[PDB]
Amino acid sequence: SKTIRSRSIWDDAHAMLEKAKAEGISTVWDRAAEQTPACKFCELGTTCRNCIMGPCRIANRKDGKMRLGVCGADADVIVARNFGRFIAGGAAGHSDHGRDLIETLEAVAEGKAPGYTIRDVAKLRRIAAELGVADAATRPAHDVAADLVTICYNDFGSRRNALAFLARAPQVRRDLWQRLGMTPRGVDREIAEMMHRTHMGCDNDHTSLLVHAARTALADGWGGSMIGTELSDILFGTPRPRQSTVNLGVLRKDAVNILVHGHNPVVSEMILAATREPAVRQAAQDAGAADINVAGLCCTGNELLMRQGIPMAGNHLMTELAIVTGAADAIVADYQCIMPSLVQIAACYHTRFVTTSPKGRFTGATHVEVHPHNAQERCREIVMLAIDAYTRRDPARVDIPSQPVSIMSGFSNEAILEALGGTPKPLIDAVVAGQIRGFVGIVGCNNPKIRQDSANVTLTRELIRRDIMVLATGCVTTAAGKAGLLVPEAASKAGEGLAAVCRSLGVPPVLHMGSCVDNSRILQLCALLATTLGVDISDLPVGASSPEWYSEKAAAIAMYAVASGIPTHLGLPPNILGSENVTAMALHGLQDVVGAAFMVEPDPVKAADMLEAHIVARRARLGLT
Amino acid sequence: SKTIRSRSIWDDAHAMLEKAKAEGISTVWDRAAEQTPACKFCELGTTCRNCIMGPCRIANRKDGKMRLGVCGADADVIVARNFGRFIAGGAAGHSDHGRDLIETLEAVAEGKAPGYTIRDVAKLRRIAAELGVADAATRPAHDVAADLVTICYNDFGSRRNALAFLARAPQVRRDLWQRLGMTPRGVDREIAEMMHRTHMGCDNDHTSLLVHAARTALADGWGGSMIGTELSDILFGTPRPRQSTVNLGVLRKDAVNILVHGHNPVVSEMILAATREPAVRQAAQDAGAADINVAGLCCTGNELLMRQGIPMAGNHLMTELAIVTGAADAIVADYQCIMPSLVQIAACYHTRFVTTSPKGRFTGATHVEVHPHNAQERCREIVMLAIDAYTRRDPARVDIPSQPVSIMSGFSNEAILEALGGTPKPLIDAVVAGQIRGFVGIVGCNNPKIRQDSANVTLTRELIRRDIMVLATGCVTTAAGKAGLLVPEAASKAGEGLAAVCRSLGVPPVLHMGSCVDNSRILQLCALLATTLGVDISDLPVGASSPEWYSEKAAAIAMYAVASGIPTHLGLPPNILGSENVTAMALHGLQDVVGAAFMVEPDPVKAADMLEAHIVARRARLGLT
Ligand code: SF4
Ligand code: SF4
Numbered sequence A, B: 001s002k003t004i005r006s007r008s009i010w011d012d013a014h015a016m017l018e019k020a021k022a023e024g025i026s027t028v029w030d031r032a033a034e035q036t037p038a039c040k041f042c043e044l045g046t047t048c049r050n051c052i053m054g055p056c057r058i059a060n061r062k063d064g065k066m067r068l069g070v071c072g073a074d075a076d077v078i079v080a081r082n083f084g085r086f087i088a089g090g091a092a093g094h095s096d097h098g099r100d101l102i103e104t105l106e107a108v109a110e111g112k113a114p115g116y117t118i119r120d121v122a123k124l125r126r127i128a129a130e131l132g133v134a135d136a137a138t139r140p141a142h143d144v145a146a147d148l149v150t151i152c153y154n155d156f157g158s159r160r161n162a163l164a165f166l167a168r169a170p171q172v173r174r175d176l177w178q179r180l181g182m183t184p185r186g187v188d189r190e191i192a193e194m195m196h197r198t199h200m201g202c203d204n205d206h207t208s209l210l211v212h213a214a215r216t217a218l219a220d221g222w223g224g225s226m227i228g229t230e231l232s233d234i235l236f237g238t239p240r241p242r243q244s245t246v247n248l249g250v251l252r253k254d255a256v257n258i259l260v261h262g263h264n265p266v267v268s269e270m271i272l273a274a275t276r277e278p279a280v281r282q283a284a285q286d287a288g289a290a291d292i293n294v295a296g297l298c299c300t301g302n303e304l305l306m307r308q309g310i311p312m313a314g315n316h317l318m319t320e321l322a323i324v325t326g327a328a329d330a331i332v333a334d335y336q337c338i339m340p341s342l343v344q345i346a347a348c349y350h351t352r353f354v355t356t357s358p359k360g361r362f363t364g365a366t367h368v369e370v371h372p373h374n375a376q377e378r379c380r381e382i383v384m385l386a387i388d389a390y391t392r393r394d395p396a397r398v399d400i401p402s403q404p405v406s407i408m409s410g411f412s413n414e415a416i417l418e419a420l421g422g423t424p425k426p427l428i429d430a431v432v433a434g435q436i437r438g439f440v441g442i443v444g445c446n447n448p449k450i451r452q453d454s455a456n457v458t459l460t461r462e463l464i465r466r467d468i469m470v471l472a473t474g475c476v477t478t479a480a481g482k483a484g485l486l487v488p489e490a491a492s493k494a495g496e497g498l499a500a501v502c503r504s505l506g507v508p509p510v511l512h513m514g515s516c517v518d519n520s521r522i523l524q525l526c527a528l529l530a531t532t533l534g535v536d537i538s539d540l541p542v543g544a545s546s547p548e549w550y551s552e553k554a555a556a557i558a559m560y561a562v563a564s565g566i567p568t569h570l571g572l573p574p575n576i577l578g579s580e581n582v583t584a585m586a587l588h589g590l591q592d593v594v595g596a597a598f599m600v601e602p603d604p605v606k607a608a609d610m611l612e613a614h615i616v617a618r619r620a621r622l623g624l625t
């Protein structure tokens, strides 16, 4: 229908929205329509529930009433406090993700994690030496792991002056954070101090609350997310370039289709291993299946895509539609961005909805809790549930749409530097020469307010055309992939400068750099370039963008990009427009403080113009053409 | 007027409300009226702002729409997540409070905190030995302090299985927390994990979220609050019984009046020490003042009351009215419960409003930031500001309304056990004999929804009539004090059994046990009694009540009281009544799990009936009349 066509740009999504409509299944778009219009105070941020002297709303009335809360807080404080807690929720998701990776590596170091090993021992020694472990190159790998585990855990403590990975930032960027009071000291500490500041009668200055919001988000990018990325590479291998496929067509009628959903790869890496055991493959064969086919959703799909080339089934707004195919025999979920509607839609079919984390509980789900010491045993049990669910699949309701699209994935910073001969010198020369005018990381989510991936794909096309290389992470990866932009042949869709560089390296114009925690790879690349050139990150021709973000995590990623000197664009505004002072600080004031600011622009073509203008100005300050 | 009469039960509050009305000064009651009626969805908790697919509201509509959020969360999840963040904000207040006391003690142990010492070396050695410091009885005091600092910091890390002070709870209670997965592991970790669970698509089971809320609150009472209390006694002294006074009459017309506001006594102890320096006193008398007069507000006033006997000017809803007296020459604030309206009301007078913590910033306030390495220097500077403001006090607008009421304060557990001869046996004997039928800790705030202190005083009167001893902390202290119930002579207002025990020990029927962190003193006392009798805290004839609470911290205290087996009464409900399942869990379901539950009752007499009934049932299970 006209309505179905306006919800997404993808054929596989349209087909499933027709199927869901015919079957009477409501989707995220339907509930988004119901929640429209939204509460004007909640939209603007001028509402507060932090105590039961309230709840309060700030209104502009003729009689001057309701200008302040019961405690006396004005709109600036109330909007800033809400935005501060919004950021802290996002940093906390990445905080727990990074914490689980430390526990897993500690379990490996102690020999209490059957089925886990240190896949990349060379990276473990490099990271441990970088963070100061003594004799990281020669001591036994388990000892080196235990000492890195200790360094990581101490960043989750309250005794550090600065996070351990903060050393990667240029000295000028560290001096700036120090003068401003933004230096992140502890991953959990900043979140706790934010929750304390936003309590009634604590931090009642909107400038102070936003400064600590930056510090909280910086504890994510250079802490929770960076620890998660680096330890994931140690535990499961550093990504290298590889081919794979994307979209709902990666589901097979003839196979047990297991969709992994969530973020943490500690579970899905063992799910994948259980599917390869001979006895488990025998059960699938005894059930009439040709194979066991694992496919990814959202960031845990990105994780298996970067390290294993596991095909990605879809991104955020594709998750419900993947069950509508009738071929999803099991959804295995850990945490974050797993819509509870999946439980009800799975109940419409044979699909087993299996939760695996103590933090990711869903009423009505099948809970098989997974920890490092039992993951190999539990994941074997979970795949068996999927094989059993496969036997009850109704074939008359199976409709897997579309043909999978080829993609190239696995562009970690190690892979990037390897493709350049080992140093960033060829990369820097291309920028100086003007072949690659700059880099933009397009990151983030889908959002029902925006036609699915319309802004992600348009902005990607606009940027590579202007010789601006795109680094894609998160749910943008699937948008760039389904658009055919994640393959080296996509250089024909770039400008002459970017196309020529890409064709000499054999890489696509859009580099898939992983999941949402892997946005720390972009911080690492930016820090590595600024240090080499002897400048700040705010001098590099770079930018960040999330045209269709939804989550608190995307807010925290955008905030730590801005606080790190990266001009960051958002397609939709946060719930802050009720305060002009907070809005001006987010859009303009931060430029005077951290060298970068937020941009809110729903037109992806204007967004490309704005990101390009920042790049052009930074190129001028570097003395480039 | 009739309106002024309905806002408070006290004459000193009535006089300042009459004064503020003639001077055209809006108070917290005026703003509460503007915010009434409140938003229904915010009141019920059935609104969510956790992502920008929303904001969402859950409504009971005839057309069936808006039953779920955009992500699919129902009312049970949305209300439970809101309550979880509500609890986390309260636990974070106490967390940063305890973290600051660890920092002060560490600065003292390092010799980098002029003017601070270890005023109770005896308690330092006892506590450090209790938590496992080697040779704590004989090693140098600073060395023992450094080891206790390390132990305390580790509870602010992520490597422990249980907080250090949890060993105080009886084994049966620790085994229960373990089976339920409620054991608090890290003060900051539980807060960070709660913010992760409440992110979209993580924890979507209201039972699970509520269980982690109890864990998050238990990390407060047995962690942040208990560390804050014990380290404050080590740094500033263990409280002992002493006489003092309460209400706005503690302000002197002929003296420089410095009101200390907030929670942390690291500041106000050095403020008081600054007013006792001879050269500082000479400056006040050279300015025309008879002396410098320090008086307390809220919990930092409780701290100076417990350890120094400093008179208390008032509690929560008295803070604005204390400036309206015209005699408040300076307000010294740290953090929590400091209404931003105090800056505006101080601007109506000569009053200087001074902030001292980097976490408690107020636009327009005079910021003199205090840290252990410069507190002695800065606090002298703050008192000099107070003397200078005193020279500008307009005498025609001064109106100190009442005569202070005598109180007795300082009833730490150490003081209680000393009064009993060193063992709990005389107390246990009184309870077995029926002279003291039970204990109820009356804790918590004021709230404009309830006539100030009307429910606090009425419940306190009702409980001591029934031979139930009351333990008072927080802003209840000022209510019980102004009603004359904090002196030994108040035994005449108690039943025959409690009066006899009180006259025998020479103590009041209401024992002031300190600030809001000092509610950990109540947990310690219950744990000591349960351990001595070989039962659970849920077997003791005990109760908790906050008849006029408002803050997130009061909610957190109530949650860890219930989770520890103490039946807890709230005069007003949290924003949870939009979910019957969550309300039934808090009011009934928790009884089957932790042995206690919440009670919501705005009638203080019925609150006494419910509290007394729980105590009677527990006396029966112990085999008592
Ligand atoms: S903190 Fe202030 S603005 Fe927020 S609900 Fe409480 S009284 Fe209202
Ligand atoms: S988390 Fe769910 S209920 Fe809350 S605002 Fe987002 S979509 Fe709505």
Ligand code: FES
Binding pocket: A039, A040, A041, A042, A043, A047, A057, B039, B040, B041, B042, B043, B047, B057
């Ligand atoms: S729902 Fe209460 S203000 Fe938006």
